């Protein structure tokens, strides 16, 4: 029989430093089978799969010998070292914890939900591929590469929050992953990355990926939410959108919008994310334009009792014309 247990071990990487689960952060929620002295990187909410640098797997949980707490890793030392990271599998289990609990504690919702409304386990596929410099959502699970020359393993709170939140979006508004809706989809995932950081450690970087870009790569971050165009390709305002702009660059519009809103007088990140989550759940449609997206935010803010003037001001600063769909 499998019962709950606690895992001790390490996380982080050469860029941000190493930390320890059981000292600097909580112990990991693992499962154990006494009868065989085997532990599994899995709990009801999150399962970590060690892809073993392959591209396909049966999705059995990562299992390690454990002869109430146990060191993680195949050598029971707390490590699963890879491309400059201490243990991407430990970090993935914790990242799933954080994103699950942010959505549940702040919104009373399951991060991932089955069609019948019951909770869907977060399946985190780690060690995916050889030198794979990407992470993605595929409609049922989240997949994370170990990186190569530009990036450390793509397992952090922010990247995990981004990828799980593609699933949250698919299961709520369904924003399609191209055009303006796709820019919004990307942005919502970048906003959730920030929410995961803030929920867990009480601060967020306003950047995507600084914790996983290698310092010798020439890049400090993948994206900047305070001024997206700092990366040389993303746009800061909707008027700079054009058809064919990649979703990872048109995401600047709603990333900048979220930054602006969260920093208005008497706002904060949580309030701004409250508006975006409620819009995702209740108003945004699969085909949304940036403009319709702003109308959804105003309707969501009205439902929450928040100040619509602050929403309108932020929308106008990113050149969104909400008047087509919201008249008051
Ligand atoms: Ca299972
Ligand atoms: Ca599939
Ligand atoms: Ca290499
Ligand atoms: Ca290098
Ligand atoms: Zn629940
Ligand atoms: Zn690996
Ligand atoms: Zn994405
Ligand atoms: Zn700005
Ligand atoms: Zn792209």
Q: Quick one: 195 and 214 in the same domain? A: yes
Distance (angstroms) between ligand 5 centre and the Cα of 100 equals 9
> What is the residue range of 305's domain?
175-328
Catalytic, out of 53, 101, 104, 248: 248
Closest residue by Cα to residue 246 from 223, 268, 269: 223
What tokens does 117 get? Answer: 């409304």
Element (H, E) at 164: helix 157-170
29 is catalytic: no
Closest residue by Cα to residue 90 from 159, 20, 23, 162: 20
166 is in an annotated binding site: yes
Last residue of a domain, one of 174, 208, 227: 174
What tokens does 274 get? Answer: 């409250």
248 is catalytic: yes
Distance (angstroms) between ligand 4 centre and the Cα of 154 equals 16
Q: Quick one: 204 and 293 in the same domain? A: yes
- 190-223 core/surface letters (b: 16 or more CB in 10 A; e: else): bbbbbbbbbbbeeebbbbbbbbbbbeeeeeebbb
Count CA atoms closer than 13 A to 141's CA, side-chain side: 17
256 is in an annotated binding site: no
Domain count, the chain: 2
Catalytic, out of 163, 170, 197, 211: 163
Report the alpha-carbon angle 188-192-198, nearest 5: 145
> DSSP readout, 45-105?
SEEEEE-TT-S----PPPEEE----EE-TTTTSS---BTTBS-HHHHHHHHHHHHHHHHHH
Q: Quick one: 79 and 119 in the same domain? A: yes
Q: Quick one: 183 and 255 in the same domain? A: yes
d(C-alpha 207, C-alpha 186), whole Å? 14
Distance (angstroms) between ligand 9 centre and the Cα of 81 equals 28
Method: X-ray
53 is in an annotated binding site: no
d(C-alpha 190, C-alpha 44), whole Å? 26
Q: Quick one: 116 and 147 in the same domain? A: yes
Q: What 3-state DSSP class applies to 143?
A: strand
Closest residue by Cα to residue 142 from 126, 129, 119, 120: 126
Q: Quick one: 111 and 79 in the same domain? A: yes
Distance (angstroms) between ligand 6 centre and the Cα of 37 equals 24
Last residue of a domain, one of 127, 149, 174: 174
Distance (angstroms) between ligand 8 centre and the Cα of 127 equals 37
Q: Quick one: 188 and 66 in the same domain? A: no
Nearest bound ligand to CA 167?
7
Last residue of a domain, one of 145, 174, 203: 174
What tokens does 273 get? Answer: 């994310």
Distance (angstroms) between ligand 1 centre and the Cα of 68 equals 22
Q: Quick one: 61 and 195 in the same domain? A: no
Distance (angstroms) between ligand 2 centre and the Cα of 166 equals 14
Q: Quick one: 13 and 59 in the same domain? A: yes
Q: Quick one: 17 and 141 in the same domain? A: yes
Q: Quick one: 121 and 164 in the same domain? A: yes
């Amino acid at each position: 029989e499998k019962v709950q247990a606690k895992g001790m071990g390490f996380g982080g990487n050469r860029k941000i430093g190493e930390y320890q689960f059981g000292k600097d952060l909580p112990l990991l929620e693992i499962t154990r089978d006494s009868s065989v002295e085997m532990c599994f990187m899995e709990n009801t909410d999150v399962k970590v799969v060690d892809m073993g640098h392959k591209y396909y797997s049966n999705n059995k949980p990562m299992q390690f010998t454990c002869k109430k707490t146990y060191y993680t890793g195949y050598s029971a030392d707390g490590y699963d070292r890879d491309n400059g990271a201490a243990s991407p599998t430990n970090d993935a289990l914790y990242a799933g914890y954080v994103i699950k609990h942010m959505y549940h504690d702040w919104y009373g919702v399951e991060a991932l939900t089955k069609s019948d409304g019951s909770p869907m386990q977060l399946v985190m596929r780690v060690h995916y591929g050889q030198g794979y410099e990407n992470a993605y959502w595929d409609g049922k699970q989240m997949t994370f590469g170990d990186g190569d020359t530009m990036m450390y393993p793509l397992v952090s709170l922010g990247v995990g929050g981004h990828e799980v939140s593609h699933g949250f979006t698919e299961q709520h508004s369904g924003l399609e992953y191209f055009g303006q809706s796709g820019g919004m989809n990307e942005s919502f995932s970048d906003m959730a990355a920030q929410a995961a950081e803030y929920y867990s450690v009480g601060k967020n970087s306003w950047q995507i990926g600084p914790e996983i870009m290698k310092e010798d790569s020439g890049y400090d971050a993948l994206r900047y939410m305070d001024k997206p165009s700092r990366d040389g390709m993303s746009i800061d305002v909707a008027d700079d959108y054009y058809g064919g702009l990649d979703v990872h660059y048109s995401s600047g519009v709603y990333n900048h919008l979220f930054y602006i809103l969260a920093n208005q007088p008497n706002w904060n990140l949580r309030m701004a994310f409250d508006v975006m989550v409620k819009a995702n759940m209740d108003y945004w449609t699969p085909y949304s334009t940036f403009d319709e997206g702003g109308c959804g935010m105003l309707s969501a803010a009205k439902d929450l009792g928040y100040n619509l003037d602050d929403i309108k001001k932020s929308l106008s600063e990113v050149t969104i014309n909400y008047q087509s769909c919201y008249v008051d």
